[PDB]
Design a protein around this ligand. Structure first.
Ligand SMILES: COc1ccc(CCN2CCC(Nc3nc4ccccc4n3Cc3ccc(F)cc3)CC2)cc1
Length: 365
Protein backbone atom coordinates (compact mmCIF):
# COMPACT_ATOMS: atom_id res chain seq x y z
CA UNK A 1 0.00 0.00 0.00
CA UNK A 2 1.05 3.58 -0.68
CA UNK A 3 1.97 5.32 2.59
CA UNK A 4 -0.15 8.42 1.84
CA UNK A 5 -3.77 8.10 2.96
CA UNK A 6 -6.42 10.78 2.37
CA UNK A 7 -10.01 11.13 3.52
CA UNK A 8 -12.62 13.13 1.65
CA UNK A 9 -13.88 15.82 4.01
CA UNK A 10 -15.94 18.10 1.79
CA UNK A 11 -17.27 18.92 -1.65
CA UNK A 12 -19.23 21.65 -3.41
CA UNK A 13 -20.52 22.51 -6.89
CA UNK A 14 -20.16 25.94 -8.47
CA UNK A 15 -23.36 27.68 -9.59
CA UNK A 16 -22.27 28.17 -13.22
CA UNK A 17 -22.18 24.37 -13.83
CA UNK A 18 -19.30 24.78 -16.38
CA UNK A 19 -16.11 22.67 -16.31
CA UNK A 20 -13.52 23.88 -13.84
CA UNK A 21 -10.23 23.61 -15.73
CA UNK A 22 -7.73 24.92 -13.18
CA UNK A 23 -7.09 25.00 -9.44
CA UNK A 24 -4.04 26.41 -7.60
CA UNK A 25 -3.24 26.77 -3.92
CA UNK A 26 -1.31 29.94 -3.13
CA UNK A 27 2.12 28.78 -1.99
CA UNK A 28 3.18 32.38 -1.14
CA UNK A 29 1.07 32.86 2.02
CA UNK A 30 2.43 33.15 5.55
CA UNK A 31 2.64 30.00 7.69
CA UNK A 32 0.01 31.61 9.92
CA UNK A 33 -2.18 32.99 7.18
CA UNK A 34 -5.14 30.87 6.03
CA UNK A 35 -4.81 28.38 3.19
CA UNK A 36 -6.26 29.83 -0.03
CA UNK A 37 -6.75 28.28 -3.45
CA UNK A 38 -8.27 29.57 -6.70
CA UNK A 39 -10.40 27.71 -9.26
CA UNK A 40 -11.04 28.79 -12.86
CA UNK A 41 -13.66 27.82 -15.40
CA UNK A 42 -16.24 29.56 -17.56
CA UNK A 43 -15.65 33.30 -17.29
CA UNK A 44 -15.13 32.89 -13.53
CA UNK A 45 -12.26 32.97 -11.05
CA UNK A 46 -13.16 32.04 -7.48
CA UNK A 47 -11.13 32.08 -4.25
CA UNK A 48 -11.74 29.69 -1.35
CA UNK A 49 -10.24 29.28 2.14
CA UNK A 50 -9.64 25.98 3.95
CA UNK A 51 -10.55 25.84 7.63
CA UNK A 52 -11.23 23.37 10.45
CA UNK A 53 -13.78 20.53 10.22
CA UNK A 54 -13.13 20.39 6.48
CA UNK A 55 -14.80 23.70 5.69
CA UNK A 56 -14.30 25.24 2.25
CA UNK A 57 -15.10 28.92 2.76
CA UNK A 58 -16.09 30.89 -0.33
CA UNK A 59 -14.17 34.18 -0.30
CA UNK A 60 -14.86 36.18 -3.46
CA UNK A 61 -15.45 35.76 -7.18
CA UNK A 62 -14.38 37.53 -10.34
CA UNK A 63 -16.69 37.40 -13.34
CA UNK A 64 -15.17 38.66 -16.57
CA UNK A 65 -17.19 41.24 -18.47
CA UNK A 66 -16.83 39.09 -21.60
CA UNK A 67 -19.51 36.42 -21.20
CA UNK A 68 -17.76 34.21 -23.77
CA UNK A 69 -14.32 34.17 -22.16
CA UNK A 70 -13.33 30.69 -21.00
CA UNK A 71 -10.54 30.60 -18.41
CA UNK A 72 -8.25 27.59 -18.53
CA UNK A 73 -5.49 28.34 -16.04
CA UNK A 74 -4.26 30.55 -13.23
CA UNK A 75 -1.03 31.19 -11.37
CA UNK A 76 -0.11 32.98 -8.15
CA UNK A 77 2.64 35.51 -7.63
CA UNK A 78 3.35 38.54 -5.46
CA UNK A 79 4.30 42.18 -5.99
CA UNK A 80 8.05 42.65 -5.45
CA UNK A 81 7.48 45.87 -3.48
CA UNK A 82 4.18 45.42 -1.59
CA UNK A 83 4.69 41.67 -0.90
CA UNK A 84 0.94 41.42 -1.65
CA UNK A 85 -0.49 38.49 -3.59
CA UNK A 86 -1.35 38.63 -7.28
CA UNK A 87 -3.24 36.12 -9.42
CA UNK A 88 -2.81 35.69 -13.18
CA UNK A 89 -5.57 34.03 -15.24
CA UNK A 90 -6.07 33.30 -18.93
CA UNK A 91 -7.90 31.19 -21.49
CA UNK A 92 -9.65 31.05 -24.87
CA UNK A 93 -9.44 34.78 -25.68
CA UNK A 94 -5.65 34.81 -25.37
CA UNK A 95 -5.82 37.67 -22.86
CA UNK A 96 -3.80 37.54 -19.63
CA UNK A 97 -5.54 39.23 -16.68
CA UNK A 98 -3.82 40.09 -13.40
CA UNK A 99 -6.36 40.00 -10.55
CA UNK A 100 -5.98 41.64 -7.13
CA UNK A 101 -7.22 38.83 -4.87
CA UNK A 102 -8.14 41.21 -2.06
CA UNK A 103 -10.60 43.19 -4.22
CA UNK A 104 -10.92 40.49 -6.93
CA UNK A 105 -10.65 43.16 -9.61
CA UNK A 106 -8.58 43.18 -12.80
CA UNK A 107 -5.52 45.42 -12.36
CA UNK A 108 -4.08 45.13 -15.86
CA UNK A 109 -4.16 42.82 -18.85
CA UNK A 110 -1.91 41.74 -21.72
CA UNK A 111 -3.04 40.97 -25.23
CA UNK A 112 -0.61 39.57 -27.75
CA UNK A 113 -1.00 35.84 -28.24
CA UNK A 114 -3.03 35.29 -31.38
CA UNK A 115 -5.01 32.47 -29.76
CA UNK A 116 -5.94 30.72 -26.53
CA UNK A 117 -3.49 30.47 -23.66
CA UNK A 118 -3.36 26.98 -22.15
CA UNK A 119 -0.89 27.51 -19.32
CA UNK A 120 0.62 30.22 -17.09
CA UNK A 121 3.73 29.82 -14.92
CA UNK A 122 5.67 32.33 -12.79
CA UNK A 123 9.44 32.19 -12.54
CA UNK A 124 10.39 30.56 -9.20
CA UNK A 125 13.01 33.20 -8.29
CA UNK A 126 11.76 36.37 -10.06
CA UNK A 127 8.03 36.83 -9.26
CA UNK A 128 7.57 39.45 -12.03
CA UNK A 129 8.35 37.04 -14.93
CA UNK A 130 5.24 35.30 -16.27
CA UNK A 131 5.39 32.54 -18.89
CA UNK A 132 2.42 31.93 -21.18
CA UNK A 133 1.81 29.00 -23.48
CA UNK A 134 -0.44 29.35 -26.49
CA UNK A 135 -2.49 27.78 -29.26
CA UNK A 136 -0.59 30.07 -31.67
CA UNK A 137 2.39 27.59 -31.28
CA UNK A 138 4.55 29.91 -29.14
CA UNK A 139 5.54 30.63 -25.56
CA UNK A 140 5.92 34.18 -24.29
CA UNK A 141 7.88 35.50 -21.31
CA UNK A 142 6.46 38.74 -19.88
CA UNK A 143 7.78 41.18 -17.29
CA UNK A 144 4.62 42.27 -15.48
CA UNK A 145 6.49 44.89 -13.47
CA UNK A 146 7.27 46.97 -16.58
CA UNK A 147 4.48 45.55 -18.80
CA UNK A 148 6.93 44.31 -21.42
CA UNK A 149 7.18 41.23 -23.58
CA UNK A 150 10.72 39.92 -23.00
CA UNK A 151 10.89 36.99 -25.41
CA UNK A 152 8.88 34.89 -27.86
CA UNK A 153 9.81 31.19 -27.99
CA UNK A 154 8.77 29.97 -31.42
CA UNK A 155 9.60 30.03 -35.06
CA UNK A 156 12.12 28.04 -37.10
CA UNK A 157 12.34 25.13 -34.61
CA UNK A 158 9.60 26.09 -32.16
CA UNK A 159 6.46 24.01 -31.78
CA UNK A 160 4.66 23.12 -35.01
CA UNK A 161 1.24 23.10 -33.33
CA UNK A 162 -0.61 24.29 -30.25
CA UNK A 163 1.49 24.34 -27.07
CA UNK A 164 -0.30 22.85 -24.09
CA UNK A 165 2.04 23.01 -21.10
CA UNK A 166 5.41 24.24 -19.86
CA UNK A 167 7.34 24.25 -16.61
CA UNK A 168 10.36 26.01 -15.11
CA UNK A 169 13.04 23.90 -13.45
CA UNK A 170 13.86 24.42 -9.78
CA UNK A 171 15.79 27.70 -10.04
CA UNK A 172 14.21 28.99 -13.25
CA UNK A 173 17.26 28.54 -15.48
CA UNK A 174 15.33 26.59 -18.12
CA UNK A 175 11.87 25.76 -19.42
CA UNK A 176 10.44 22.54 -20.84
CA UNK A 177 7.37 22.93 -23.02
CA UNK A 178 5.18 20.43 -24.81
CA UNK A 179 2.17 20.25 -27.07
CA UNK A 180 0.05 18.84 -29.93
CA UNK A 181 3.06 18.21 -32.16
CA UNK A 182 4.14 15.30 -29.86
CA UNK A 183 7.29 17.22 -28.97
CA UNK A 184 8.97 18.33 -25.77
CA UNK A 185 11.33 21.30 -26.03
CA UNK A 186 13.88 22.74 -23.63
CA UNK A 187 14.57 26.51 -23.64
CA UNK A 188 17.44 27.79 -21.50
CA UNK A 189 16.85 31.24 -20.04
CA UNK A 190 20.19 31.63 -18.23
CA UNK A 191 21.95 32.18 -21.54
CA UNK A 192 23.60 35.57 -21.80
CA UNK A 193 21.06 36.60 -24.47
CA UNK A 194 18.06 35.86 -22.23
CA UNK A 195 19.79 37.36 -19.14
CA UNK A 196 20.37 40.63 -21.01
CA UNK A 197 16.82 40.57 -22.38
CA UNK A 198 15.47 40.16 -18.84
CA UNK A 199 17.72 42.97 -17.56
CA UNK A 200 16.77 45.31 -20.40
CA UNK A 201 13.09 44.59 -19.71
CA UNK A 202 13.57 46.06 -16.23
CA UNK A 203 15.45 49.13 -17.52
CA UNK A 204 12.72 50.01 -20.02
CA UNK A 205 11.30 53.52 -19.49
CA UNK A 206 8.53 54.61 -21.92
CA UNK A 207 8.47 58.17 -20.63
CA UNK A 208 12.20 58.24 -21.38
CA UNK A 209 12.42 57.03 -25.01
CA UNK A 210 10.20 56.71 -28.06
CA UNK A 211 11.57 53.40 -29.41
CA UNK A 212 9.31 50.44 -28.54
CA UNK A 213 10.69 47.50 -26.59
CA UNK A 214 11.44 44.63 -28.98
CA UNK A 215 10.99 41.08 -27.73
CA UNK A 216 13.82 38.61 -28.28
CA UNK A 217 12.73 36.12 -30.94
CA UNK A 218 14.03 32.73 -29.72
CA UNK A 219 13.72 30.28 -32.66
CA UNK A 220 15.87 27.31 -31.56
CA UNK A 221 15.33 25.34 -28.35
CA UNK A 222 18.33 23.96 -26.54
CA UNK A 223 16.97 20.40 -26.91
CA UNK A 224 13.99 18.84 -28.64
CA UNK A 225 12.49 15.33 -28.74
CA UNK A 226 9.48 13.55 -30.22
CA UNK A 227 10.61 10.11 -28.98
CA UNK A 228 8.83 10.10 -25.62
CA UNK A 229 5.15 9.91 -26.69
CA UNK A 230 3.41 8.95 -29.92
CA UNK A 231 0.59 11.53 -29.56
CA UNK A 232 0.04 15.01 -28.11
CA UNK A 233 1.66 15.87 -24.80
CA UNK A 234 -0.70 17.77 -22.55
CA UNK A 235 1.36 18.11 -19.35
CA UNK A 236 5.06 18.36 -18.43
CA UNK A 237 6.78 19.02 -15.10
CA UNK A 238 10.38 18.88 -13.95
CA UNK A 239 11.25 16.24 -11.33
CA UNK A 240 14.58 17.60 -10.22
CA UNK A 241 16.63 17.26 -13.42
CA UNK A 242 14.27 14.54 -14.70
CA UNK A 243 11.07 15.21 -16.64
CA UNK A 244 7.54 13.86 -16.17
CA UNK A 245 5.21 14.14 -19.14
CA UNK A 246 1.95 12.56 -20.30
CA UNK A 247 -0.03 11.93 -23.44
CA UNK A 248 -3.40 10.18 -23.75
CA UNK A 249 -1.98 6.65 -23.42
CA UNK A 250 -2.72 6.30 -19.69
CA UNK A 251 0.81 6.78 -18.45
CA UNK A 252 3.07 9.51 -17.10
CA UNK A 253 6.57 8.94 -18.53
CA UNK A 254 9.70 9.79 -16.55
CA UNK A 255 12.65 10.54 -18.83
CA UNK A 256 15.71 12.77 -19.31
CA UNK A 257 17.59 14.05 -22.37
CA UNK A 258 20.71 12.21 -23.42
CA UNK A 259 22.11 9.01 -21.96
CA UNK A 260 21.42 7.98 -18.37
CA UNK A 261 24.77 9.30 -17.08
CA UNK A 262 24.57 12.63 -18.96
CA UNK A 263 24.41 15.90 -17.03
CA UNK A 264 21.44 18.05 -18.01
CA UNK A 265 23.54 21.19 -18.25
CA UNK A 266 25.92 19.62 -20.80
CA UNK A 267 23.19 18.45 -23.20
CA UNK A 268 23.85 20.15 -26.56
CA UNK A 269 20.99 21.28 -28.85
CA UNK A 270 21.81 18.55 -31.40
CA UNK A 271 21.48 15.79 -28.77
CA UNK A 272 19.47 12.95 -30.32
CA UNK A 273 19.11 10.55 -27.36
CA UNK A 274 16.65 10.37 -24.48
CA UNK A 275 16.50 7.93 -21.60
CA UNK A 276 13.19 6.54 -20.35
CA UNK A 277 13.53 5.62 -16.69
CA UNK A 278 10.02 4.24 -16.30
CA UNK A 279 6.34 5.14 -16.20
CA UNK A 280 3.35 5.55 -13.88
CA UNK A 281 0.45 3.49 -15.29
CA UNK A 282 -3.23 4.15 -14.66
CA UNK A 283 -6.50 3.84 -16.52
CA UNK A 284 -9.39 5.87 -17.91
CA UNK A 285 -7.52 9.14 -18.45
CA UNK A 286 -7.23 9.32 -22.23
CA UNK A 287 -9.19 12.52 -22.87
CA UNK A 288 -7.47 15.74 -23.90
CA UNK A 289 -6.27 18.28 -21.28
CA UNK A 290 -5.92 16.36 -18.00
CA UNK A 291 -3.10 17.78 -15.87
CA UNK A 292 -1.06 16.19 -13.10
CA UNK A 293 0.45 18.00 -10.13
CA UNK A 294 3.10 17.49 -7.46
CA UNK A 295 3.47 18.78 -3.91
CA UNK A 296 6.01 21.45 -2.98
CA UNK A 297 8.82 19.06 -2.05
CA UNK A 298 7.87 16.69 -4.92
CA UNK A 299 7.20 13.75 -2.59
CA UNK A 300 3.76 13.14 -4.11
CA UNK A 301 2.30 13.04 -7.61
CA UNK A 302 -1.46 13.39 -8.20
CA UNK A 303 -3.52 12.86 -11.35
CA UNK A 304 -7.30 12.80 -11.71
CA UNK A 305 -8.94 10.56 -14.29
CA UNK A 306 -12.05 11.06 -16.45
CA UNK A 307 -14.49 9.25 -14.12
CA UNK A 308 -13.56 10.96 -10.88
CA UNK A 309 -10.77 8.74 -9.56
CA UNK A 310 -7.79 10.57 -8.07
CA UNK A 311 -4.43 8.76 -8.10
CA UNK A 312 -1.63 9.72 -5.69
CA UNK A 313 1.87 8.19 -6.00
CA UNK A 314 4.64 8.21 -3.41
CA UNK A 315 7.66 9.58 -5.31
CA UNK A 316 10.12 8.97 -2.44
CA UNK A 317 9.98 5.10 -2.78
CA UNK A 318 12.35 2.64 -4.43
CA UNK A 319 10.92 1.11 -7.60
CA UNK A 320 8.43 4.01 -7.78
CA UNK A 321 7.28 3.26 -11.35
CA UNK A 322 6.29 -0.24 -10.19
CA UNK A 323 4.67 0.75 -6.88
CA UNK A 324 0.91 0.88 -6.49
CA UNK A 325 -0.66 4.31 -6.09
CA UNK A 326 -3.28 5.37 -3.61
CA UNK A 327 -6.64 5.65 -5.40
CA UNK A 328 -9.14 8.11 -3.89
CA UNK A 329 -12.80 7.64 -4.86
CA UNK A 330 -16.09 8.99 -3.58
CA UNK A 331 -19.36 7.55 -4.88
CA UNK A 332 -20.66 11.08 -5.60
CA UNK A 333 -17.52 12.05 -7.57
CA UNK A 334 -18.00 10.69 -11.09
CA UNK A 335 -17.04 13.58 -13.37
CA UNK A 336 -13.65 14.15 -15.00
CA UNK A 337 -11.04 15.67 -12.67
CA UNK A 338 -9.19 18.31 -14.69
CA UNK A 339 -6.52 19.47 -12.24
CA UNK A 340 -5.54 19.04 -8.59
CA UNK A 341 -3.56 21.14 -6.16
CA UNK A 342 -1.72 20.42 -2.91
CA UNK A 343 -1.53 23.01 -0.17
CA UNK A 344 1.96 24.31 0.65
CA UNK A 345 2.34 21.89 3.58
CA UNK A 346 0.82 18.91 1.69
CA UNK A 347 -1.98 18.60 4.26
CA UNK A 348 -4.76 19.22 1.72
CA UNK A 349 -5.37 18.09 -1.86
CA UNK A 350 -8.11 19.80 -3.89
CA UNK A 351 -9.56 18.38 -7.13
CA UNK A 352 -11.80 20.25 -9.59
CA UNK A 353 -14.14 18.66 -12.13
CA UNK A 354 -15.90 18.99 -15.48
CA UNK A 355 -19.24 19.25 -13.64
CA UNK A 356 -18.00 22.28 -11.62
CA UNK A 357 -17.55 20.23 -8.44
CA UNK A 358 -14.69 20.76 -6.01
CA UNK A 359 -13.42 17.98 -3.74
CA UNK A 360 -11.28 18.41 -0.61
CA UNK A 361 -9.05 15.54 0.54
CA UNK A 362 -7.22 15.72 3.86
CA UNK A 363 -4.07 13.72 4.58
CA UNK A 364 -4.48 11.49 7.61
CA UNK A 365 -2.23 12.87 10.33
C1 LIG B 1 11.41 23.25 -3.82
O1 LIG B 1 12.71 22.68 -3.75
C2 LIG B 1 12.83 21.33 -3.97
C3 LIG B 1 14.04 20.70 -3.69
C4 LIG B 1 14.16 19.34 -3.89
C5 LIG B 1 13.11 18.57 -4.37
C6 LIG B 1 13.25 17.08 -4.59
C7 LIG B 1 13.69 16.75 -6.00
N1 LIG B 1 13.77 15.31 -6.27
C8 LIG B 1 13.91 15.05 -7.70
C9 LIG B 1 13.90 13.57 -8.00
C10 LIG B 1 15.02 12.89 -7.27
N2 LIG B 1 15.03 11.46 -7.55
C11 LIG B 1 15.83 10.90 -8.52
N3 LIG B 1 16.72 11.55 -9.24
C12 LIG B 1 17.27 10.59 -10.09
C13 LIG B 1 18.25 10.71 -11.06
C14 LIG B 1 18.61 9.59 -11.76
C15 LIG B 1 18.01 8.35 -11.52
C16 LIG B 1 17.02 8.20 -10.56
C17 LIG B 1 16.68 9.34 -9.86
N4 LIG B 1 15.75 9.55 -8.84
C18 LIG B 1 14.86 8.54 -8.27
C19 LIG B 1 13.49 8.62 -8.92
C20 LIG B 1 13.36 8.52 -10.29
C21 LIG B 1 12.12 8.59 -10.89
C22 LIG B 1 11.02 8.78 -10.10
F1 LIG B 1 9.79 8.86 -10.69
C23 LIG B 1 11.11 8.89 -8.74
C24 LIG B 1 12.36 8.81 -8.16
C25 LIG B 1 14.96 13.18 -5.80
C26 LIG B 1 14.89 14.69 -5.55
C27 LIG B 1 11.91 19.22 -4.65
C28 LIG B 1 11.76 20.58 -4.45
Amino acid sequence: KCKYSFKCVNSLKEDHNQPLFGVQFNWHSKEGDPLVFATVGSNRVTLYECHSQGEIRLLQSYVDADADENFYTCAWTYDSNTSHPLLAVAGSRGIIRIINPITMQCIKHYVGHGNAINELKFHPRDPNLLLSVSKDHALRLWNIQTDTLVAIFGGVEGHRDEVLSADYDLLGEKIMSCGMDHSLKLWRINSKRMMNAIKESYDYNPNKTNRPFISQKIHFPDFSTRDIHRNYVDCVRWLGDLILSKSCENAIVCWKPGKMEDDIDKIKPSESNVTILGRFDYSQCDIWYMRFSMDFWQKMLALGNQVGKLYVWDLEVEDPHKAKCTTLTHHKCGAAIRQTSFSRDSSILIAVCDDASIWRWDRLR
